[PDB]
Amino acid sequence: WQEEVAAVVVVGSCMTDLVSLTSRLPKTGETIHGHKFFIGFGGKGANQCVQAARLGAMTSMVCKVGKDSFGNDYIENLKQNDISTEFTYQTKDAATGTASIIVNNEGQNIIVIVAGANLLLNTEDLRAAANVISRAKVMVCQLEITPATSLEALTMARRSGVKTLFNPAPAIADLDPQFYTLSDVFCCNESEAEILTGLTVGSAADAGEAALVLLKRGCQVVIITLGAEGCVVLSQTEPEPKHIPTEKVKAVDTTGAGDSFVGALAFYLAYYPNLSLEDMLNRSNFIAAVSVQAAGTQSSYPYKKDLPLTLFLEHH
Amino acid sequence: QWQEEVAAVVVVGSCMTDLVSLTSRLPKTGETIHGHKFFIGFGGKGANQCVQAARLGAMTSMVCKVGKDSFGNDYIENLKQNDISTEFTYQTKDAATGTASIIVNNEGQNIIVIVAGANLLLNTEDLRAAANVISRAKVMVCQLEITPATSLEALTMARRSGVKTLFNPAPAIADLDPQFYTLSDVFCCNESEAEILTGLTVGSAADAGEAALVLLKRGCQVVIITLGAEGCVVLSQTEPEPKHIPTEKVKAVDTTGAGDSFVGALAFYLAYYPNLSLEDMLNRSNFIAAVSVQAAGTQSSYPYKKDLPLTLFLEH
Numbered sequence: 188w189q190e191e192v193a194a195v196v197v198v199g200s201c202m203t204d205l206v207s208l209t210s211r212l213p214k215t216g217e218t219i220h221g222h223k224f225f226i227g228f229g230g231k232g233a234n235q236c237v238q239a240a241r242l243g244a245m246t247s248m249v250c251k252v253g254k255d256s257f258g259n260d261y262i263e264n265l266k267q268n269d270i271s272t273e274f275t276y277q278t279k280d281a282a283t284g285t286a287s288i289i290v291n292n293e294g295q296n297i298i299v300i301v302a303g304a305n306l307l308l309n310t311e312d313l314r315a316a317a318n319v320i321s322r323a324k325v326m327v328c329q330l331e332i333t334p335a336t337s338l339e340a341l342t343m344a345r346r347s348g349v350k351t352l353f354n355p356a357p358a359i360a361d362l363d364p365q366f367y368t369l370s371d372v373f374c375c376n377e378s379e380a381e382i383l384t385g386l387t388v389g390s391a392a393d394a395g396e397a398a399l400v401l402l403k404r405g406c407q408v409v410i411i412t413l414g415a416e417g418c419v420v421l422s423q424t425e426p427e428p429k430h431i432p433t434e435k436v437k438a439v440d441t442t443g444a445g446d447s448f449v450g451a452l453a454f455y456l457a458y459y460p461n462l463s464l465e466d467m468l469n470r471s472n473f474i475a476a477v478s479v480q481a482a483g484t485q486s487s488y489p490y491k492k493d494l495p496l497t498l499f500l501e502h503h
Numbered sequence: 504q505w506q507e508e509v510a511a512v513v514v515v516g517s518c519m520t521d522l523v524s525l526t527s528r529l530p531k532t533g534e535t536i537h538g539h540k541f542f543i544g545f546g547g548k549g550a551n552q553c554v555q556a557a558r559l560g561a562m563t564s565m566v567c568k569v570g571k572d573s574f575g576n577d578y579i580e581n582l583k584q585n586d587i588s589t590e591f592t593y594q595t596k597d598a599a600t601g602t603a604s605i606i607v608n609n610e611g612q613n614i615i616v617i618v619a620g621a622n623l624l625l626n627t628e629d630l631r632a633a634a635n636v637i638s639r640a641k642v643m644v645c646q647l648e649i650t651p652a653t654s655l656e657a658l659t660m661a662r663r664s665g666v667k668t669l670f671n672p673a674p675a676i677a678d679l680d681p682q683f684y685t686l687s688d689v690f691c692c693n694e695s696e697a698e699i700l701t702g703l704t705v706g707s708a709a710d711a712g713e714a715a716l717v718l719l720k721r722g723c724q725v726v727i728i729t730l731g732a733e734g735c736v737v738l739s740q741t742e743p744e745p746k747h748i749p750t751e752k753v754k755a756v757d758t759t760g761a762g763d764s765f766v767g768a769l770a771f772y773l774a775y776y777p778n779l780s781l782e783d784m785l786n787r788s789n790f791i792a793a794v795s796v797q798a799a800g801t802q803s804s805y806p807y808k809k810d811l812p813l814t815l816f817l818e819h
């Protein structure tokens with residue numbers, strides 16, 4: 188008997204985060220000593236997948252890691268979060284992707300990303316995932332893997348009528364035009380928006396303007412997250428920007444909040460399709476805001492059993 | 504056991520996992536950059552020294568503390584692969600294995616963040632359980648990448664048993680307890696360490712000669728200051744006139760870890776060739792350290808006895 192399908196498929200990155208906490212950031216040629224080191228699980232794709240899974244989504248992570256200790260440990264992390272690893276591949280040709288992060292006591296950081304194995308996730312690897320993709324409700328992609336691969340995944344999703352949620356992160360100024368036209372929901376932050384559009388974006392009104400450019404490039408729904416100001420949304424049917432504020436909380440660590448938001452949104456798009464988009468975004472704001480109230484990235488992302496029941500009910 | 508060969512060189516000191524990312528530029532505050540390769544290597548001054556000695560044929564034992572974690576288990580396998588005893592390599596769940604996060608551009612310039620972690624939990628009770636191995640050694644080597652009190656106690660234990668002490672005050676500490684000098688049979692440091700320890704400007708063999716005498720007068724029996732490509736300068740209580748021992752000119756590939764190669768070669772000679780003159784030991788140690796600078800990769804650059812000329816192992 189054919190079992191429950193994954194409703195949320197994430198094609199994207201897994202990165203081992205190698206974090207050192209220090210009291211100052213080093214300069215060229217310097218050695219410095221920090222006071223704490225830890226390994227965390229990151230990568231935009233996996234962050235998003237994990238948030239959606241913890242909310243109860245059945246998910247499948249399509250990604251490539253290394254045939255190495257960090258890749259075996261990432262696979263176990265996915266499984267622990269009840270994520271299908273059927274299309275989590277391993278390769279000996281490159282190490283699992285890494286992010287080396289140095290963070291001083293003011294939260295300023297230096298980051299060196301080596302994408303590694305993530306970049307060897309190829310179009311044949313996606314084709315083997317075709318039946319899972321075609322049965323999904325939502326496909327989520329970012330800009331951490333090879334762009335040809337992500338383009339293919341969005342293409343495959345469209346061909347089966349699967350909703351596409353694209354997060355253009357990290358952003359680049361000459362993004363292939365297809366990424367706008369293949370996105371049903373296009374979601375980025377202020378700094379990404381500024382890179383994509385060339386406009387200065389430092390307010391919800393500014394984000395409104397930038398969103399309109401992204402819409403005219405061929406997006407259907409455009410969401411710009413705004414940190415503690417919440418998010419702003421527009422769409423082809425309602426092109427007037429709608430600012431969706433979020434209640435004032437005292438942040439502990441905002442790292443990974445955007446991924447929390449996107450994963451929440453993927454969950455809602457997949458399991459609650461009749462909610463209004465404004466409702467989905469209020470809920471996604473809420474969930475991301477819970478994540479900013481805890482340290483870490485993925486270890487901050489809330490589970491369904493710790494969130495209020497009202498986040499899982501149909502509209503009042 | 505008593506009639507068989509025991510560890511002649513016991514190193515009480517540090518082990519660090521090197522987390523290396525290759526990039527084309529070094530990042531600055533706030534920046535995220537991408538590199539093109541990530542790999543894991545083995546470092547820490549104590550383990551580096553031990554590895555060089557072992558490779559030259561010494562029977563060695565590494566007294567150190569790593570984490571009860573993957574990097575600790577791997578560090579232990581690295582020690583064993585290099586025929587080093589890990590009887591007193593401890594593992595703790597209370598901190599992670601020491602790490603060095605190293606970012607290296609294409610010119611070989613680097614930023615390095617060290618988190619000493621587990622190395623700082625090596626304590627006097629750990630040394631007490633190692634007391635019999637320490638007491639039976641010919642040479643005990645320590646540095647300053649563990650708690651200084653612990654290196655001091657190791658030095659003390661060695662002196663109580665008549666074991667030769669080789670102290671590398673690296674990285675240096677400006678208010679180093681005076682007892683360290685009185686417990687050091689051979690005190691070996693580099694120019695920049697000598698400057699921190701003495702307050703003198705040290706940028707030449709002649710400057711080093713002066714700083715060395717300051718160190719000798721603090722109570723060291725022998726003082727050696729390494730000088731990079733200029734070789735080393737040595738003095739002793741018996742012969743307080745500086746002797747500059749040059750090294751033949753080679754084309755360096757990577758000098759990282761050269762001082763540890765020199766120290767480990769010296770420990771080897773002190774333990775297995777005690778009838779050589781010191782000048783001879785230092786000529787040979789310069790040579791071996793100069794071999795290491797001609798290859799990439801720190802411990803992976805440290806030569807083995809079978810690849811070195813026969814003249815390095817001939818007797819008095």
Ligand SMILES: Nc1ncnc2c1ncn2[C@@H]1O[C@H](COP(=O)(O)OP(=O)(O)CP(=O)(O)O)[C@@H](O)[C@H]1O
Binds near residue numbers: 418
């Ligand atoms: N300080 C805060 N208070 C409440 N919610 C916050 C918040 N910072 C972030 N969020 C929530 O997380 C969402 C994503 O924020 P954003 O994309 O700005 O995240 P990010 O990962 O770039 C970290 P940051 O916002 O600190 O730069 C926001 O839409 C909001 O819902």
Ligand SMILES: Nc1ncnc2c1ncn2[C@@H]1O[C@H](COP(=O)(O)OP(=O)(O)CP(=O)(O)O)[C@@H](O)[C@H]1O
Binds near residue numbers: 762789
């Ligand atoms: N360029 C070079 N050519 C030949 N031998 C070298 C060398 N650099 C270092 N060595 C050898 O290594 C020994 C230790 O040198 P030093 O203590 O300066 O190493 P180090 O680990 O501090 C790196 P660096 O010397 O580049 O600053 C020297 O005494 C010498 O024998």
Ligand SMILES: [Cl-]
Binds near residue numbers: 208209210220221
């Ligand atoms: Cl610190």
Ligand SMILES: [Cl-]
Binds near residue numbers: 334361
């Ligand atoms: Cl692109």
Ligand SMILES: [Cl-]
Binds near residue numbers: 662686
């Ligand atoms: Cl004494």
Ligand code: NA
Binds near residue numbers: 356376445446
């Ligand atoms: Na983001």
Ligand code: NA
Binds near residue numbers: 440441444479
């Ligand atoms: Na958080």
Ligand code: NA
Binds near residue numbers: 673693762763
């Ligand atoms: Na040194």
Ligand code: NA
Binds near residue numbers: 796797804
């Ligand atoms: Na070298």
